[PDB]
Design an enzyme around this catalytic site. Structure first.
Site, mmCIF file in Angstrom:
data_model
loop_
_atom_site.group_PDB
_atom_site.id
_atom_site.type_symbol
_atom_site.label_atom_id
_atom_site.label_comp_id
_atom_site.label_asym_id
_atom_site.label_seq_id
_atom_site.Cartn_x
_atom_site.Cartn_y
_atom_site.Cartn_z
ATOM 1 N N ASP A 281 9.497 -23.511 12.982
ATOM 2 C CA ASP A 281 10.316 -22.763 12.044
ATOM 3 C C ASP A 281 9.545 -22.385 10.791
ATOM 4 O O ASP A 281 9.670 -21.278 10.273
ATOM 5 C CB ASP A 281 11.537 -23.587 11.663
ATOM 6 C CG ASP A 281 11.906 -24.202 10.325
ATOM 7 O OD1 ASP A 281 11.053 -24.246 9.440
ATOM 8 O OD2 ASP A 281 13.044 -24.642 10.173
ATOM 9 N N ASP A 305 7.815 -16.783 22.976
ATOM 10 C CA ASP A 305 8.661 -15.621 23.057
ATOM 11 C C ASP A 305 9.064 -15.117 21.700
ATOM 12 O O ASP A 305 8.923 -13.908 21.400
ATOM 13 C CB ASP A 305 9.911 -16.015 23.836
ATOM 14 C CG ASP A 305 10.555 -14.794 24.395
ATOM 15 O OD1 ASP A 305 9.987 -14.204 25.304
ATOM 16 O OD2 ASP A 305 11.632 -14.428 23.924
HETATM 17 MG MG LIG Z 1 15.141 -25.655 9.186
HETATM 18 MG MG LIG Z 2 9.905 -11.819 24.859
#
Ligand SMILES: [Mg+2]
Ligand SMILES: [Mg+2]
Ligand SMILES: NC(=O)c1ccc[n+]([C@@H]2O[C@H](COP(=O)([O-])OP(=O)(O)OC[C@H]3O[C@@H](n4cnc5c(O)ncnc54)[C@H](OP(=O)(O)O)[C@@H]3O)[C@@H](O)[C@H]2O)c1
Ligand SMILES: NC(=O)c1ccc[n+]([C@@H]2O[C@H](COP(=O)([O-])OP(=O)(O)OC[C@H]3O[C@@H](n4cnc5c(O)ncnc54)[C@H](OP(=O)(O)O)[C@@H]3O)[C@@H](O)[C@H]2O)c1
Lengths: 414, 414
Positions: A281, A305
């Site tokens: 993240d 992805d």
């Molecule tokens: Mg977070």
């Molecule tokens: Mg993709």
């Protein structure tokens, strides 16, 4: 049965872990659904022109169309979305390429793109992402982005193991988890879908291994292991630990400072390649705020992805992002953008993605001259602002071109 | 044992699904590790000033410090990272707030932030994200971003169910999957970590339910269900199907065109709220390329993590992103950025995140006047470019302020 093998042309072979490509190689290709009908013909012509120019007529590809997706149904029959023959043909000819692909919905059929990757065990999803001058981009400094994504392509939740809520299998799995494994963290066990997230050590190190060898052969600055290991310790976190271990085990990785970063010395240029890691993240934030600090990226299937799509969008290359699926025996390059049915057949779509994927294919084949010419062509055409509607609509002073015309512009700039 | 309940002050209570807040409410707060020592005192002073200004001294919060994380260890002992008393105190006083938190590594301890969320069953992770004029941002038009993220906060792989590779439990689970469930898609069964992805229907609809009611009460334009349902059909995809179904079942959702989008009429403003959905990876592209088309977002735990962090970074608010964990009985607001140990105690850090989370807390308490003043204060301070180093280092013409000084600037702009 309906594929026609080129009369003239020769099979690529694999020997000593190295491809042996004839000057007249037969290359299987899938047109692709939707705009694949527009981008693939443009790609064929651009590649042929690059090959002709680079080797003076001494080399030439013998394209061979094979089928998958809608055209396969119309060639082989009602629910033939992926004929076994296609898989055999990619195996036999070693290298192939395909346009946009769409999966059917309502028939319990899972992703055809993933099916190709897993049954040919193309565990490497390679997405090179860098900015082409002249491209309209949503961010201030897209030029700072120059990364190469190595996406694990065979395992993770992306592998399709799951069971539907309320089905007998799902309740059976939940029963086993709660009563035999003592799981207490399922907030609501009833009416609950269940999915499985696998991540092995061999799958992790052959992917990271390929990423480090790539950093070495291309003299890149570093390899970043992206993961979400502080929450998923035994899959995401294990991927990161096995990645560092591989670097130590096979590339003489040495500790930088007090760790955890490592440094691998490039055996050919002496450059110290940095091996480090970043939580997924925070990484999606760092690619925007500090893009120049990253280069080669190594990560799992789902995160790969997300990351590849986010990077492609920030450099304005959502429709020109090249992509390849590579394994130890076979290789399938591919458009990476959608089928775009609402413009299909109108000769509008941007062929840059599949063409750059063809560029990766030629380079993978050892035909680096021809690949260089394609990159040069994309370079000049886009910089000259002679582009398709998806680019032109976001900018001023550009010359609008049809898909086929853009293909010619690329050739003209070689 | 070591917490001191405020002599003056009264407990907030829950009646009829509605909070009853006294004018002298006792609010539990956790200082937070690292820079929490810098941002929380600034937050206390800013909130008190907003409350004093807005209600003319008729209201006042009785702060009560409770512990979690490192300070808890130093208050309660060696491995007391999360005392049961803390949980009881948040339950008893209904509303609380906490600064940066860090989890220990090497002791098999899982995320303390997640532990709080799951044992208080704060299934709603609310992350409002919008641009503050004057903030340095990596993108061209951050003002176009104005979204409210509703992150499912109790279930998904984020729930911590997994087993380590080569452990007896992991091999046991793998054996069950392969031999009793007939799973054949595990590429490498040996030396493989396993994680479980749960997603129930009740967990999905109470989260989506809260998102739609939020769109209604705040007159927002639409609710987008973000998922990766084309690969994970029974969890991600089920989340999306249950989301649309809820909209039909409880909010009179009507079909738009030929579907799948729905439209819910706002019972109070008559506005037609659009209910739609977008696949997660493409969504990370859309928030950059077409940010104005999205508003309220509803999604699962992990994707919510990614999405909220990516949006916060693009508007340059990585250090001022407010966040809240809300359930049906309790509520915990929180900083959303890291502990930043390398500047902790230097009065450098940016307190904007926890302060805006305090703004969300006051509004949740019904004290909308005081909350409005805090937003106004952040508005003017940042627009005036009197900010902390994380902002100032990325810009010109700004006045550098310490963390505490920035807190004063916010008050000055109320
Ligand atoms: Mg977070
Ligand atoms: Mg993709
Ligand atoms: N690599 C692949 O072969 C691949 C990848 C991803 C998806 N797909 C498949 O395709 C199918 C088509 O359906 P969809 O229309 O719902 O797709 P979608 O959600 O992927 O649409 C992608 C969007 O990007 C734009 N776009 C994509 N390719 C473009 C190109 O070459 N030039 C210019 N703009 C381009 C269009 O947006 P606007 O320009 O209109 O804004 C487009 O509709 C999907 O079902 C999916 O299975 C194939
Ligand atoms: N909501 C929370 O309470 C929360 C959230 C996330 C993480 N954490 C915890 O904190 C611990 C601290 O360790 P880390 O240093 O490795 O953290 P980290 O990876 O989160 O670092 C975040 C980075 O953002 C910057 N930053 C964060 N907060 C800032 C603020 O208020 N003002 C200005 N810049 C800020 C600093 O980057 P530069 O400015 O140096 O570039 C910083 O080191 C982590 O272990 C994590 O458990 C707490």
């Amino acid at each position: 049965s309906k594929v026609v093998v080129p009369a003239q042309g020769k099979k690529i072979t694999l020997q000593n872990g190295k491809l042996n490509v004839p000057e007249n190689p037969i290359i299987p290709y899938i047109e692709g659904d939707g705009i694949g009908v527009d981008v693939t013909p443009a790609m064929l012509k651009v590649v042929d022109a690059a090959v002709e120019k680079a080797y003076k007529g001494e080399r030439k590809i013998s394209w061979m169309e094979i089928y998958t997706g809608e055209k396969s149904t119309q060639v082989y029959g009602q629910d033939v979305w992926l004929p076994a023959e296609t898989l055999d043909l990619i195996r036999e000819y070693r290298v192939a390429i395909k346009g946009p692909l769409t999966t059917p919905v309502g028939g319990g059929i899972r992703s055809l793109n993933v099916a190709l990757r897993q049954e040919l065990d193309l565990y490497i999803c390679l997405r090179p992402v860098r900015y082409y001058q002249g491209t309209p981009s949503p961010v201030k400094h897209p030029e700072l982005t120059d990364m190469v994504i190595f996406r694990e392509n065979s395992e993770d939740i992306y592998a399709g193991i799951e069971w539907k809520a309320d089905s007998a299998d799902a309740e059976k799995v939940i029963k086993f988890l709660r009563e035999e494994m003592g799981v207490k963290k399922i907030r609501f066990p009833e009416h609950c879908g269940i999915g499985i997230k696998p991540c092995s050590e061999e799958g992790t190190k052959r992917l990271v291994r390929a990423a480090i060898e790539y950093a070495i052969a291309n003299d890149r600055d570093s390899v970043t292991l992206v993961h979400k290991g502080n929450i998923m310790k035994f899959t995401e976190g294990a991927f990161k630990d096995w990645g560092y271990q591989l670097a130590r085990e096979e590339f003489g990785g040495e500790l930088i400072d007090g760790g955890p970063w490592l440094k691998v010395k490039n055996p050919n240029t002496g450059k110290e390649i940095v091996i480090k890691d970043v939580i997924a993240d925070a990484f999606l934030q760092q690619i925007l705020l500090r893009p120049a600090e990253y280069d080669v990226i190594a990560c799992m299937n789902l995160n790969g992805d997300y990351i590849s799509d986010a990077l492609a969008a920030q450099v304005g290359g959502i429709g020109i992002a090249p992509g390849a699926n590579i394994g130890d025996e076979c290789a399938l390059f591919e458009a990476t953008h959608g089928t775009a049915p609402k413009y299909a057949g109108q000769d509008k779509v941007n062929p840059g993605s599949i063409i750059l994927s063809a560029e990766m294919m030629l380079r993978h084949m050892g035909w680096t001259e021809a690949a260089d010419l394609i990159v040069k062509g994309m370079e000049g055409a886009i910089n000259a602002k002679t582009v398709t509607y998806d680019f032109e609509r976001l900018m001023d002073g550009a010359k609008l071109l049809k898909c086929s015309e853009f293909g010619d512009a690329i050739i003209e700039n070689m």
